[model samples]
Target: EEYIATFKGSEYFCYDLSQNPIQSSSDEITLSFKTLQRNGLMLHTGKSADYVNLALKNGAVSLVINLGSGAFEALVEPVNGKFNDNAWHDVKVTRNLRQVTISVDGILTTTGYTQEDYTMLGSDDFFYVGGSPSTADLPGSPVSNNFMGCLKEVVYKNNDVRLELSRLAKQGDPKMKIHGV
Candidate 1:
């Protein structure tokens, strides 16, 4: 069995990247996970008013980036429950300046364009995996606010991030509970 990160929904489980910082030049992110939860957060950055995130909602997966000037959003709602169906799935969201694309399990699902050029706030900003630090006024209710179930991996800029998945898997340490170690 593969070691994974699991969230219990009520507890705010996430991999904090505040100290690490998300690359300002970051153009792509990938997530792999499995869950039966109806809605859950995949990744979130920036403050409550403005942020970028990827999430699973209503049997579909979506990417949303709100940078004040404008936002980029793409929804991949395939026939049947191709995504968010309580099964293992791989999702990738890529942004090349104003253009965005979403692919699930290697299948091209959706694409979008932003009104303005992509520009992040600052390096002091935070990044997270598995869920957002705070709730957001979006669809899918609270389900998208927090995440539940297993998060296998999260990659940013074609590199594996420091979510402490291996440490959690190897040690099952309580200190690693609900947060990255």
Candidate 2:
């Protein structure tokens, strides 16, 4: 069974994992997924003031990680019409104590430095999938970061998470599906 999530560029979804949050002290954070959307939020967490956002902009892939003190960013510009060609592309985000790296289709794009004591930005915050709260009020604000197109095969924290996103997509109980392109 194959399952994928679709965001109509407005509606977004979230996974509450406060009971079993991603451990930032583990020294590394990894996330992998597939998408064809041109622009919109891919994944996001933390509050409006401080958050980590992975998104596409002007045919380029960008990762923004914000700790309480500041923000870090990386980019993968379209090479030979890649990443924004309206085709499925593999993407990965890896973070370590030293830096956060962004890769497309197994190719390293770029990296940004991390603060010396940076453990995680929003470990306790709700884990957002298609998008995140665009405003500080949350739950009340429109999902400004909503994504468009299908998102499949999301792997987080190198398989240390209690929830399996891909498996959840297969179930379709949460409204995920082929969402054909």
Candidate 3:
């Protein structure tokens, strides 16, 4: 079936040129990406916004996801993210029809809800970074927050959970090779 992206400016969806179409499901459907020059998600104070609705932080070697809400009322507080050293690593975060999983350097760090209050299921929403279209905080105190740095490689999956690692390890050994765009 075909799905429409709710985020405006779908045509502007950028991809990592070095590894375009990061990953495809069933060997089809190209996933899009936007290289953030700053942080993952940004929101102004008072104008509560959730980050959970954002896109998967998938790289050829690593992946991360934000399960934060845009609103203060429905906000999922204390959502944690592991080491952010601004380096290339094996990261993968996937959200299927049921749940969401975050894997870093081929290791699972945390697992949580893919949808906040079931409103996100099958919504065909846009997977965006730097800024979310449908998400906006009210107060706007932070002022024009953006992500910095380079992000490459992204893989999208539906129901495939075959990629699991027993040991919850990290990938900052210094011996690991780093890839750049």
Candidate 4:
């Protein structure tokens, strides 16, 4: 589970989202990254109608999602903005129904709820890591570059399975379509 990949804002990799589909009421994601630029996309999953987005906005971490009804957009600059210092940072995202929690570096924590009208996160697309081939096509995305630094240990899990994304992509697993990883 110790694999680190670098990105030049022009590269990205992906694995099947079906392997780690969003749970009906709960889900969790963990990742580590050290960025160089002020903007980029960290992770993105789901289809046009429903999706999750983790991005760097003006040197701060931002998250936007659509469970079903609408969107819950939050830009977590709670660290007062020194997040893009090229230093490794661990991030975790937890979901229990509409309640969601996000932790960065295990020091800064934030929690919020998604649209109350919907609780299930459904998707059949690939889990685009560090960026996507067509970023603008991603729902609720804010960054253009995707990710412009390094990423390691990007993982996703529910009650059924845990995917070690970075490691799997590093091994060049058949399920992955990797580029510059």
Candidate 5:
């Protein structure tokens, strides 16, 4: 189980993917990690450029882009919001070579970034989670977008076919679903 902690008013998820080399933006990104929602809350966000996702007011979730110039918002958002601490979710990131998407728990949800955004991605860093520099660290406090949850079972692919979320392990599911305490 992976946990996150914060000290400043900023949020960021720094990842080091030095082991992998992906240069195509059309590649699909998938994961079997978890997103946590404590008490009765159903939404969370990362307050940085590294995995700094945004949950819209319409119950949709999307990632925030920090292109060094300013920032751009995604057209698609998360459709689910039921986050519990003890539950896990299966997630995937894929595109039809035009529109990039992120699916949670085998359900197609969230969209952002088009072919016009970037031609390719180039990085080699240990992937970090739960924080970004594009937003604040506290909820509504500017830095509240920091993801407050647990993540596990992460996998990435560039040329392989789409992986089904249902094929994930039941004991290590981390798709960001929350159930009642």
Candidate 6:
């Protein structure tokens, strides 16, 4: 009963964000998904030493971030025993200056701060969802395989702009590219 994008292991998509830059000072990303994938990429975006990656590993949600330096990791442990139980899970990621927060399923949360005051994420070119063609080489992506599941209500926002990603992809916007979805 919701607009969703389905990925089948090899399927993936990219929503161009060259025009809508990922905020350097503050930003937020929210999404809901249901998957039986034990390990796969969920989202990745960034350039050089600046990027963000979210993925599943052994049914645990892992968030990796790089603010123009080394990667910092935060983990959301399985709330009720598992993440690949075909249940919808809500995720929220927010960044304020050098501080970052990630919440999963509204209960488990992880937070971290960059060592230095510099939190510039540089220029992100695309919001690669589900997976990318070359995920292993993509910034901080920990998985090579694409996500196999359904994603809905994906959104991104900063102080300047708001984007409904799922709706835009549903409309086949020019900035979006679908592959095997």
With candidate 1 superimposed using the best TM-score fit, by how many Å does residue 13's alpha carbon deviate from the native? 4.6
Flag clash pairs in model 2.
none
After TM-score superposition, the amount by which residue 123's alpha carbon in candidate 1 deviates from its true location, in angstroms, is 5.0
Ranking by lDDT: 4, 6, 1, 2, 5, 3
Q: List ranges where model 2 is wrong by over 4 Å.
A: 26-37, 48-50, 133-145, 158-162, 169-181
Tell me how many clashing residue pairs each candidate has.
0, 0, 26, 2, 42, 0
Put down candidate 1 lDDT per residue, 18-97, tens digits, no spaces. Answer: 56665453367766878786677876666543556778776577677764457767777767556656678888777665
62: Cα error in model 4, Å: 0.8
Residue 129 in model 2: lDDT: 65
Q: Which prediction has the highest TM-score against the true structure?
A: 6
| lDDT, candidate 3, 1-181, per-residue tens | 2221212222112212222221222211122223322223321111112222332222121222222342211211112343334444344445543255544554434554433443232212233333333323412222122333333333333343221111101122222122212
TM-score of each: 0.73, 0.74, 0.37, 0.91, 0.48, 0.92
Worst 10 residues of 3 by lDDT: 161-170
Sliding window of 10 residues with minimal summed lDDT for model 6: 115-124
- Root mean square deviation (Cα) for candidate 2: 4.9
Regarding TM-score, does 1 or 6 come out ahead?
6
Which lDDT tens digits does candidate 5 get at residues 31-92?
Answer: 44344432111122223332223332233334443322233445333444553334565555
Global CA lDDT computed for model 1: 0.61
Window of ten residues with lowest summed lDDT in model 4:
16-25
TM-score of 5: 0.48
lDDT of 3: 0.28
In candidate 6, position 163 carries an lDDT of 72
Give the lDDT of residue 108 in candidate 3. 35
Residue 5 lDDT, candidate 2, scale 0-100: 67
Which portions of model 5 show Cα errors greater than 4 Å? 1-21, 33-60, 64-81, 84-86, 111-117, 124-126, 132-144, 160-181
Expressed as tens digits, the lDDT of each residue in 79-173 for candidate 6 is 45688888899999998877989999888899998656677776549988888888789877767778888888788777777877777778788
